[PDB]
């Protein structure tokens, strides 16, 4: 009964080092930074306490997107080295998603892909929605998707930019970070994957595999609506973009898309399972972003247990589908 967490983050000491040369951004305001973000000891302590055996860690947002094109490749190389080295400290319990210097020229990005492919304990790539600066449906980004897919690396798509702040209205500050995090993040994810599907990225790179943060954002709920809008669209019909042999979003959700379990609900989880299948769901925690305010921070976490109990509500404890989502799927797909 191996338990694997595929949605878990760290800010390495080398990453925090360069964060304190900037007074622009990254930064009462914002989040408070603790040892849980930086200390690998605190990570393994969290894993032991919460019954987690193997973690596929990844750098948290904003990654390297804010960096200048000249410094970004060098910084990405150093941070990815740290990740590989951190994984070697606890062999068999730690793997990682590498981050790419997407603010650098395409050549440097493709060179990074070749390097991280040959880094120990690396099993994939984490990337945001901005791409090279014009989203994931940017034609210049196709050779990047092709290189990542050929390298046998899983793409972990993660939000950061959310939606433009105006949408939340002039009272947004009164609700804390609830609106950007609860809505902005999953909506950003959905738009990005929709733009990918509409541009035909999945068709052009059919070996590409995609893991989606927060159960696809809202994708499992909006998939049917997206399909209906596609088949009825006059512009797409006239231009011959909708033939009979066209791969529907449901087919892509079951052939090329994986979903995480960080949805905090059995309602949402049931929708995601019915979208991709119980074999294509993977348990996550989003550690260390949601710590208890009243309860002890060094003990068990509320965010991790809510996602765990939802699985038991969805597929039942003891069954093959439960052991798969909780870890055995990640072991299978990410070669652990």
Binding site for a copy of itself (CB under 8 A): 28, 31-32, 134-135, 137-138, 163-164, 166-171, 174-179, 181-183, 186-187, 190-191, 194-195, 198-199, 214-215, 218, 220-237, 263-268, 270-271, 274-275, 290-293, 302-303, 306
Q: What is the CA radius of gyration of the chain?
A: 20
Which of 218/286 has CB closer to Zn ion? 286
Q: Is 192 exposed, middle or buried (0-12, 13-18, 19+ CB in 10 A)?
A: buried
Cβ 50 to a copy of itself, closest distance in Å? Answer: 16
Q: Which does 302 bind (CB under 5 to 8 A by kind): a copy of itself, Zn ion, none?
A: a copy of itself
- Tokens of residue 90, six digits: 């606890």
Cα distance between residue 193 and residue 212, in whole Å: 9
Residues 278-317 that bind Zn ion (CB under 5 A): 286
Nearer to Zn ion, 9 or 280 (CB): 9
Dump the DSSP string for 130-146: SBTTTBTT-GGGHHHHH
Smallest separation (angstroms) from Zn ion to the CB of 214: 8
Residue at shortest CB range from Zn ion? 286
> What's the min distance (Å) between Cβ of 182 and Zn ion?
13
Q: Which does 68 bind (CB under 5 to 8 A by kind): a copy of itself, Zn ion, none?
A: none
Q: Name the DSSP class of 287.
A: B
Q: Judged by CB, which is closer to Zn ion: 212, or 334?
A: 212
Cβ neighbours of 140 (radius 10 Å):
11
Measured from the CB atom, the residue of 166 and 245 that comes closer to a copy of itself is 166
Helices in the chain by DSSP H: which ranges?
A: 13-19, 35-38, 40-49, 72-89, 106-117, 142-150, 178-179, 185-199, 201-204, 219-232, 234-238, 249-255, 266-276, 302-314, 320-323, 329-333
Assess contact for 41 and 91: CB atoms under 8 A.
no
Give the nearest distance from C-beta 309 to a copy of itself in angstroms.
11
- Nearest distance from C-beta of residue 4 to Zn ion, angstroms: 16
Coil vs helix vs strand at 309 = helix
Q: Which is nearer to Zn ion, 55 or 286 (CB)?
A: 286
Contacts with Zn ion, residue ranges (CB under 5 A): 286
């Amino acid at each position: 009964p191996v338990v694997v967490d595929i949605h878990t983050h760290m800010y390495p000491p080398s990453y925090i080092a360069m964060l304190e040369k900037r007074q622009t951004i990254p930064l009462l305001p914002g989040r408070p930074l603790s040892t849980h973000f930086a200390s690998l000891a605190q990570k393994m302590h969290f894993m032991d306490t919460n019954g987690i055996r193997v973690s596929v860690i990844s750098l948290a947002n904003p990654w390297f997107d804010f960096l200048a094109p000249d410094e970004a490749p060098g910084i990405a190389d150093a941070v990815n080295a740290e990740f590989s080295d951190m994984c070697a400290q606890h062999v068999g319990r730690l793997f990682f998603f590498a981050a790419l210097p997407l603010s650098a020229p395409v050549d440097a990005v493709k060179a990074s892909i070749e390097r991280v492919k040959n880094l120990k304990y690396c099993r994939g790539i984490i990337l945001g929605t901005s791409g090279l600066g014009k989203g994931l449906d940017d034609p210049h980004l196709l050779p990047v998707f092709e290189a990542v897919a050929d390298a046998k690396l899983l793409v972990f798509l993660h939000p950061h930019y959310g939606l433009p702040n105006e949408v939340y209205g002039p009272r947004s500050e009164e609700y804390g970070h609830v609106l950007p995090l609860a809505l902005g993040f999953p909506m950003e994810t959905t738009i990005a994957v929709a733009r990918m599907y509409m541009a035909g990225v999945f068709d052009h790179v059919r070996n590409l595999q995609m893991l989606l943060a927060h159960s696809g954002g809202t994708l499992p709920f909006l998939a049917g609506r997206i399909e209906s809008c596609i088949v009825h669209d006059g512009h797409l019909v006239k231009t011959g973009k909708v033939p009979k042999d066209r791969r529907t979003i449901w087919t892509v959700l079951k052939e090329q898309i994986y979903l995480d379990a960080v949805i905090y609900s059995e309602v949402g989880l049931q929708a995601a399972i019915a979208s991709s299948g119980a074999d294509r769901l993977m348990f996550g925690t989003n550690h260390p972003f949601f710590p208890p305010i009243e309860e002890d921070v060094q003990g068990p976490w509320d965010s991790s247990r809510l996602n765990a109990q939802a699985v038991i509500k969805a597929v039942g404890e003891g069954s093959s589908d439960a052991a798969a989502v909780m870890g055995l799927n990640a072991v299978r797909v990410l070669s652990l």
